Design an enzyme around this catalytic site. Structure first.
Site, PDB file in Angstrom:
ATOM      1  N   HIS A  70       0.805  -1.220   0.000  1.00  0.00           N
ATOM      2  CA  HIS A  70       0.000   0.000   0.000  1.00  0.00           C
ATOM      3  C   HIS A  70       0.846   1.281   0.000  1.00  0.00           C
ATOM      4  O   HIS A  70       0.282   2.369   0.185  1.00  0.00           O
ATOM      5  CB  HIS A  70      -0.966  -0.006   1.188  1.00  0.00           C
ATOM      6  CG  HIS A  70      -0.308   0.212   2.514  1.00  0.00           C
ATOM      7  ND1 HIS A  70      -0.037  -0.821   3.386  1.00  0.00           N
ATOM      8  CD2 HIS A  70       0.118   1.343   3.128  1.00  0.00           C
ATOM      9  CE1 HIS A  70       0.535  -0.338   4.474  1.00  0.00           C
ATOM     10  NE2 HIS A  70       0.641   0.972   4.343  1.00  0.00           N
ATOM     11  N   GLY A 121       3.439   5.705   9.595  1.00  0.00           N
ATOM     12  CA  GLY A 121       4.736   5.414   9.025  1.00  0.00           C
ATOM     13  C   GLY A 121       5.424   4.188   9.582  1.00  0.00           C
ATOM     14  O   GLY A 121       6.501   3.827   9.092  1.00  0.00           O
ATOM     15  N   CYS A 150       4.443   1.192   9.231  1.00  0.00           N
ATOM     16  CA  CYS A 150       4.250   0.062   8.333  1.00  0.00           C
ATOM     17  C   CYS A 150       5.576  -0.348   7.702  1.00  0.00           C
ATOM     18  O   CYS A 150       6.431   0.487   7.397  1.00  0.00           O
ATOM     19  CB  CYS A 150       3.234   0.413   7.246  1.00  0.00           C
ATOM     20  SG  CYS A 150       1.540   0.591   7.849  1.00  0.00           S
TER      21      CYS A 150
END
Ligand SMILES: *C(=N)[C@H](C[C@@H]1CCNC1=O)NC(=O)[C@H](CC(C)C)NC(=O)c1ccc(-c2ccc(OC)nc2)cc1
Ligand SMILES: *C(=N)[C@H](C[C@@H]1CCNC1=O)NC(=O)[C@H](CC(C)C)NC(=O)c1ccc(-c2ccc(OC)nc2)cc1
EC number: 3.4.19.12
Lengths: 304, 304
Positions: B41, B143, B145
């Site tokens: 993503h 952030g 991820c």
């Protein structure tokens, strides 16, 4: 997000852990520049620990009686000295993985990350707080002595703790990197007592601010209380007294959540007097005091 | 000694964390050999996350649309592909700090260490357990991820988790290093539900064995109970059912403490039916289930 007990990344500290052997005793050492730091009771056998004279014990030892191992590589000891309870070994090779570091003496209530080591090899990492009686609640088996506690400021490693011994109550005690014990302890196998441990109030309030930030708000009342009315109630329940200095450290947390510190003390006053009634706060049925106001802002901002 | 929640040393994982930028989105990536792994993503803007077609979104992207940064050094992307929910970037440089690693898919109840990263820089480390509903209870800001969970077997790093999203209940969900989500989740900004979370019974029993080892023995009764009588009581209190396989994993712990597993279940049965009456076990007012039998033996032996 969520809130968890978080330890600093141990990468830079891992490169400074060496194995120090003297006779039959083996513990961990800290290799910074051309100096190795380790607890002085490595020169003790099983019988000296009952009542050691480290001056007379170290005098019988020479440089070649110390075996320093950085992995499977032997370091040559060319000098040795004793500074308080820490024994310092000068080696012929400067550690190439030495980070920017400082030697600090933390105060009660402050936290740090512990890298538990055995035979100079890292085993795990966890966060520890310095109790008001200068003890810590860690996990330390045999040979864990020489493990160090530290903080990290971007690129600088603040070494602040070295493990030395365990108390009869199961808690642990140690020194700073200058050999000075935290508290009234000595490196001797004798019955030693720690003081009455009290609760770090400024840390409980910071932990409650993290709860409101993360969603847990059932404890939030609208009652109020003076700094003096809370302090007399905090002394009944074995809590550190709150000073104006403590309220200033919680300032950034107060101005962000819209919850005045005096109102936070009222909700804590009710939680202390009325219990928790089986509920939970951040997945805990007790009031945690191992989170400083800095730790909360650390996790709520991602300092990286 | 004591018993603490302990994370693996993050040194080897730290050297594989890079920053991956695509357009305006920035998250963390895992740089192993000549491949960078990161959540897919990253190719999403704020509006695609509501309902993304990753096939059509990645098709519009080329190699130069991906900025990989290992510190202040830019990596050249020469190839890219999508494997399930993980996006793989081939780079022209093999990571020199690549450790011996494996890609594993853990099972519910097993634990691992999480290295929380932001902008490709390590921020902290903590231990997490895989809940029976395939969620985790971590600490993840924006952030975060691309942060990875891992285990360490002496010199081999078993990567097993990558962070992707947060659920409405505040818990977190992610994939393995092959892009397959743990549980029934998808990488889309939509209302997703996790199943009814239950308690890992084999982990509670292991935690009670660690309590007896460390001194806490007030909960120890001498009552007994069949594996079937405990299982029907465990289902009432939302506990996983105990199988003979589970009793075999607690074997080494049973033969060391002299406490049969069937007697341990009786003490747990009484603790579940009669509460804890305000006492504490290992400094906790609740029954912890984030310690596997392996974690207890790990801490009671110092695997280093
Ligand atoms: C270092 N490797 C080791 C770590 C200790 C041992 C296991 N867990 C730990 O935290 N440290 C030691 O062996 C030190 C060595 C001395 C010379 C500093 N000693 C102790 O840790 C220790 C001393 C005294 C007692 C004790 C407890 C009760 C009691 O009742 C009268 N008397 C003495 C325990 C441990
Ligand atoms: C990655 N950097 C980031 C980490 C998340 C954000 C902050 N904390 C985290 O754990 N992940 C995301 O932004 C992902 C991106 C998608 C495309 C995978 N999304 C989410 O984390 C997320 C999705 C949905 C919801 C949500 C909650 C309630 C609700 O009610 C109807 N609907 C949706 C939240 C977060």
């Amino acid at each position: 997000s969520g809130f968890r007990k978080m330890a600093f990344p141990s990468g830079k500290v891992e490169g400074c852990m060496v194995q120090v052997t003297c006779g039959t005793t083996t513990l961990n050492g800290l290799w910074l520049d051309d100096v190795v730091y380790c607890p002085r009771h490595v020169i003790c056998t099983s019988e000296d620990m009952l009542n050691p004279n480290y001056e007379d014990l170290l005098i019988r030892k020479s440089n070649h009686n110390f075996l320093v191992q950085a992995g499977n590589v032997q370091l040559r000891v060319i000098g040795h000295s004793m500074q308080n309870c820490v024994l310092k070994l000068k080696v012929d090779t400067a550690n190439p993985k030495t980070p920017k570091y400082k030697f600090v003496r933390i105060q009660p209530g402050q936290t740090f990350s512990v890298l538990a080591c055995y035979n100079g090899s890292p085993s795990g990492v966890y966060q520890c707080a310095m109790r008001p009686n200068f003890t810590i609640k860690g996990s330390f088996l045999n040979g864990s002595c020489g493990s160090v506690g530290f903080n990290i400021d971007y690129d600088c490693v603040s070494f602040c703790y070295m493990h030395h011994m365990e108390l009869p109550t199961g808690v642990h005690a140690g020194t700073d990197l200058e050999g000075n014990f935290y508290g009234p302890f000595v490196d001797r196998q004798t019955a030693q007592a720690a003081g009455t441990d009290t609760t770090i109030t400024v840390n409980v309030l910071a932990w409650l601010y993290a709860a409101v930030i993360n969603g847990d708000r059932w404890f939030l009342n609208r009652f109020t209380t003076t700094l003096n009315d809370f302090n007399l109630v905090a002394m009944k329940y074995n809590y550190e007294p709150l000073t104006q200095d403590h309220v200033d450290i919680l300032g950034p947390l107060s101005a962000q959540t819209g919850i005045a510190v005096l109102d936070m003390c009222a909700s804590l006053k009710e939680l202390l007097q009325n219990g928790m009634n089986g509920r939970t706060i951040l997945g805990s049925a007790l009031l945690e005091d191992e989170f400083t106001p800095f730790d909360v802002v650390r996790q709520c901002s991602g300092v990286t």
